[PDB]
Design a protein around this ligand. Structure first.
Ligand code: THR
Length: 340
């Protein structure tokens, strides 16, 4: 494992070392604006298998192909609707992933055996450079062991994968902190498959209201066209309890619960915006933008400690909050206490 630290002035020879790894069929973990990704060359069927092996990822849970040029979209997908071309122009580079029908060129291991492919153009210099210099499209899910919280720093990637993968590009902590929004363009209206770093209200204001996949609300699925729909995700070792409702009524139940669980002989962690004394505490922030940026960090911090149970302070679904609440709920296994 070579760990390459690149700072905002990108020493291109550094990226080239990782480029080489990609062309050679090896694994390279890289930052995006969203979360750290675990890359292989998307055109190399065998390289992509290593992604699945390394993570312990079920073969039918697809990967998202990352691109740096609009030209490459035409290469990876067939029958692209003009409305997908339009969203692409408008939101790329950025935290939006489009599901489209796939071309012959795309190996089925990438798509989890399907005719659809998921594509995105990341808003991160490093990731773009890595793809440009790599001269390959890069298949990548989140750079974490399957089931576990997503990585928002090279540290997180290293705690899961140092000595197991060829390369980690350290670009620091990711700016948004939650995964890209995934929308299915194989039907109209588009279907929200995974809420994410591009809020639903940005899409709807442009194209009107879209359909929400039941998966987003907890429906278990047999076939997934996108990541983050099938199997369990984002989850620390601990049990997680999400406490939803008005600020002060929530904070009071978290006090009740801290105590009730200590009385029970358990170490409690709390993640939220309020003050609390408990075995472990992580301050997520006051804005939802700050909370999304710290979510996974906080879940990893808790996961590196004794805590038997974590108590999370919910947020409203506005903006990034739909993504944050999607992640918290799935992590908890829909273990939800609605004060209200
Ligand atoms: C790694 C990053 O690209 C992730 N798969 C996402 O879509 O957000």
């Amino acid at each position: 494992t070579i760990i390459i630290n690149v700072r905002e002035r990108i020493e291109e020879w550094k990226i080239r070392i990782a480029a080489g790894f990609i062309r050679e069929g090896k694994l390279v973990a890289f930052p995006t604006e969203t979360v750290y990704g675990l890359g292989a060359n998307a055109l190399d069927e065998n390289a992509v298998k290593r992604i699945f092996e390394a993570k312990g990822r079920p073969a039918d849970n697809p990967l998202i192909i990352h691109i740096a040029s609009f030209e490459q979209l035409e290469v990876l997908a067939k029958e692209i609707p003009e409305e997908a071309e339009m969203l692409a122009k408008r939101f790329w580079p950025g935290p939006l992933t489009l599901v489209l029908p796939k071309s012959e060129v795309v190996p089925r291991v990438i798509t989890g055996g399907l005719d659809t492919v998921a594509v995105r153009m990341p808003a991160h210099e490093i990731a773009l450079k890595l793809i440009e210099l790599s001269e390959r499209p890069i298949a990548a899910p989140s750079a974490n062991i399957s089931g576990k919280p997503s990585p928002t720093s090279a540290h997180h990637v290293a705690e899961d994968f140092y000595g197991k993968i060829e390369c980690i590009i350290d670009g620091g902590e990711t700016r948004i902190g939650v995964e890209s929004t995934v929308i299915d363009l194989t039907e109209w209206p588009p279907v929200l498959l995974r809420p994410g770093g591009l809020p639903l209200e940005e899409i709807e204001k442009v194209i009107g209201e879209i359909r929400i996949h039941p998966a987003v609300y907890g429906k278990s699925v047999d076939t997934a066209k996108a990541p983050g729909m099938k199997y369990r995700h984002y989850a620390p070792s601990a049990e997680v309890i999400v406490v939803e409702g008005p600020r002060d009524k929530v904070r009071r139940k978290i006090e009740e619960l801290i105590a009730k669980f200590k009385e029970e002989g358990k170490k409690v962690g709390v993640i939220g915006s309020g003050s609390y004394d408990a075995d472990e505490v992580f301050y997520l922030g006051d804005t939802v933008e700050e909370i999304a940026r710290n979510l996974f960090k906080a879940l990893r911090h808790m996961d590196r400690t004794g805590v038997d149970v974590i108590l999370a302070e919910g947020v409203e679904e506005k903006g990034l909050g739909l993504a944050v609440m999607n992640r918290l709920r799935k992590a908890s296994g829909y273990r939800i206490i609605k004060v209200h």
